[PDB]
Write a protein that binds this ligand. Sequence first.
Ligand SMILES: Nc1ncnc2c1ncn2[C@@H]1O[C@H](COP(=O)(O)OP(=O)(O)O)[C@@H](O)[C@H]1O
Length: 714
Amino acid sequence: RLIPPMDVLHQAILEWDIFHEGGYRCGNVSDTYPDPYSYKQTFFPLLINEAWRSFVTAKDETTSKPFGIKVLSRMTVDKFMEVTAAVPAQISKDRGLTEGDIVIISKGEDPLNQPQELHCLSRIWKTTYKKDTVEVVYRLNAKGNQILPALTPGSEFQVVKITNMTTIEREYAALESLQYYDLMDEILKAQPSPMLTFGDEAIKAVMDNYQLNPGQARAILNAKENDGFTLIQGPPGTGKTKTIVAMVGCLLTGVLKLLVCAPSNAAVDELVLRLKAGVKTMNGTFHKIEVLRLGRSDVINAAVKDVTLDELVKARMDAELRDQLHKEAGEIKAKLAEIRPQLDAARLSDDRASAMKLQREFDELKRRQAHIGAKIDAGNTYARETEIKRRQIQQEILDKAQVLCATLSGSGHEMFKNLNVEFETVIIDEAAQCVELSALIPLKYGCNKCILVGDPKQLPPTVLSQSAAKYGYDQSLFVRMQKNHPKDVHLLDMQYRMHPEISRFPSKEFYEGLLQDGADMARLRLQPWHQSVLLGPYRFFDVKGSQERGPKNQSLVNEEEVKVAMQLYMRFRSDYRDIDLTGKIGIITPYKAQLQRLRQKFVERYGESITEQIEFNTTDAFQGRECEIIIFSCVRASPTGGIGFMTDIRRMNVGLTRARSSLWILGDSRALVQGEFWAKLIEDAKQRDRYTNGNIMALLSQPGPRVSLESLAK
RNA sequence: UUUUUUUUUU
Ligand SMILES: Nc1ncnc2c1ncn2[C@@H]1O[C@H](COP(=O)(O)OP(=O)(O)O)[C@@H](O)[C@H]1O
């Protein structure tokens, strides 16, 4: 049984005043723990802090238009006040009211901006669709609530949906049920299985069978042999997804269940798409295995909806599947409406036979109407049987699937509480991008083998709480395990994405010179526009500009960098007209206001069609993805006060390692020198002749110089 | 040295 009581968490959350900016005892995170008690004492307050800051952010950011509810009933359940309330069905569907949402119920008309009004924090417990109404079961804290005497039956209130706490509930569930985990010892001690050394012959055999390099084959062999935690660190372009697919085939060699998880839906979708192509066992046989995606069809790729469990169950139930009775009733009533005036006229004119016939027809129509009305009154048992058939179909589909892919929170769904399933082996992708409690979620189903593919050198998980991030809540389990046992981590050491000039600096400065380029990589990234000196594989443009707060005091904008980016795109496109660039260019900037300004100006000049040829994004919203050419706007321009979160080397590495063929960086050096590694990058660009300064708008206004003929020979 | 930034939710 792995269903802990959610009373404590719900009470802690419902005992909050919404009007504060922004309990508990938040401490630092240790490397190891002796007992689940210490683990809980460390991580529960940090979870509460993260939840609190997420709630404040969602309150300030939400824009759900309020709506009126009618209080139908009030009850006391546990230590909570339960209020059933009626809501219009269309309003409910528009605002998406489901079980677990956090809402503000107020008496005033604008609840979000009326603290002095009768307000309360409530959690949705059940949503029941009747006909044109929705019965919502709100649950609030029964200790100290202003609206408690005012929620009498019939009283009307105004509600606004703030956020949802399903993810928090699942992470708390995993936290409280950790004490029964098969891998509890390894999770507490952060101890992965020891590094295995294999013979070069078996390594070469795996390489030949799966078309892998030595590091990937070593990682796969250690994932097949070792039990417990196996850590695989995959720098950019090292082949993480290919390794995972070959590893899934390798583990299923015997079977021919396996739970592949990722923190985001995008990574899950990529893994599903790659596993749909098919795996191959170590025997060398190609098998099109059964890949099953778990999640709602709204956050799921259009290409993987063919293998989504929900879609499969819906398709199966659509074959087994009162309104015709209503149609016939309408038609018989129309016949009655026809017959009645005819009968009245035949009776008002002393027409014996005609009135007799019409009365006979009238009586037959009334008989049919009574029959249809009796049948209409004839469930709910059919609905229950449909739900039972749904459950059966779910189980039957799950039992035939060999690999199940999911998000971390999605793998802790309530569904599995009524489905007999165990996941012996779990592979967590993007292992360094999720907090520890999220990683623990898929491990409650009897997992004794966990392969963590990640990269702590890139971005950490989103921790809105600056205090919890300072306490160490932004540390993934991967990071702690590698912190304690670094020699047991399998590093993928060969990248196949960046031109050697692009990868040169990150490899040395972030991967200790251990990230080597693949064979024939410079020749693979050879592009025609590299013949232009200023359009080479890698370059830093010292765009001396000025930073400025975005609209509504958002983030930062550098209009000169936007102008230079437009000028660079114009020069490149004009000097190379015959190159198909659709989907080959990306423009990334770590500040959202600069991103919006870049998109705005590019659409002003080139129209909305420009977004099909250029991927506009922020540095954080680009991880895992890549483009042929990357224009990187640094935005920061104030020579004092630092460069903000530009100082974090993980974000810098992510931003530098997105490009394949060309990376063109635009930054005001006078400000960026404040950061140590940005200074090192600018100096490196200088001492290798990849730095350009002066009037950049003028240097890009004309077609620029070409590279020497002798350099192209080599 | 003024975090302003991202995942998650049947
Ligand atoms: N041994 C290899 N030889 C040649 N190319 C490889 C090898 N391993 C990986 N690659 C290339 O690297 C790519 C890795 O894809 P992906 O897993 O998305 O990279 P990332 O590690 O950035 O997620 C593959 O598409 C493949 O073309």
